């Protein structure tokens, strides 16, 4: 009966996916061109997208003509240089020549401008969106990633985001991250740690502005594709677990209360990020299959709440694969942000989420 209300929800969340075909087209186009012209520069010629086929994923549950999209290029024999004790930020240094690596031209130094390479891909973006038809920049202010912000027509928006590749092994401050030894197994952690992992250009604590930040969000959506116990978890009618519902929900609790309360101004620090971090958290307390079974949603949902809840009361988020970097360490959201949003979750549910309706 009450969760009657949770499958409403999603059931109106996935309305906005069947007609997602005639604006993904539009997305699809636009990036194709901007590979194409950014790959005719020696710079860029490696550049590509994450996933070829996913060319677009959706950071917010509840804006569907709001794009996501990640270029890579990889960046042979990197070297990587902590800054401070942050764990997650890094200066990029190379092995080899200048004269053997094409990122030469955007050496300071030693070390790889982040704020040089942003530059340029920005501008060439931006030359070249000037000779496509329906499609604007919007164009920043948030650390370097994402870079750019395109308006297709006067309503999709497609967020393009720089990423080095590395195919090097990860970095050591991921030794005792993604504890998924319990839940998707060893062999599978042992896979996933050999693939490359990646750097985004991101401001770090005034700031230091040529630092790089590490990212997993193809890790990320490779647990969410293949996120159970059972290799055949939601294959069939008798293994349909809540996982996947249960993040959707989390965001979209997020985003409701960041909507509720924009006037106010103490949510803006949080992200989806954030219950995303904190649903591989409960994932990973929670291992068993058994334990999502769709017809236990309601309780599945609410174990989430009150996992993310203690995170804020506790001030404790870590990194999923960077356990000592705290998404809600004090310097970077503050207390009375945290317990804003306490007290509105924690009104929330105990009034069984008015903000759904
Ligand atoms: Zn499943």
Known sequence: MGASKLRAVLEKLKLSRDDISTAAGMVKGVVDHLLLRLKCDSAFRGVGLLNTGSYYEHVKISAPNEFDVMFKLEVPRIQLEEYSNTRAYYFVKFKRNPKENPLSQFLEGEILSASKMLSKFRKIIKEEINDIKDTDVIMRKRGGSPAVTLLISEKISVDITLALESKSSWPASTQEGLRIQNWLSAKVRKQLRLKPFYLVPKHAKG????????????????ILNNHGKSKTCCENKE??????????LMKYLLEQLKERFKDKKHLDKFSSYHVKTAFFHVCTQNPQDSQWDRKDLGLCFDNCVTYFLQCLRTEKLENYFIPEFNLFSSNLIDKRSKEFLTKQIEYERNNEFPVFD
Do not use: A, G, P
């Not at 700031?207 to 490779?222: A, C, D, G, V």
């Not at 677990?241 to 249960?246: E, G, L, M, S």
């Open 207 to 222: 700031f230091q502005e040529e630092t790089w930040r590490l990212s997993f969000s193809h890790i990320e959506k490779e």
């Open 239 to 248: 293994e349909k677990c809540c996982r996947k519902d249960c993040l959707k």
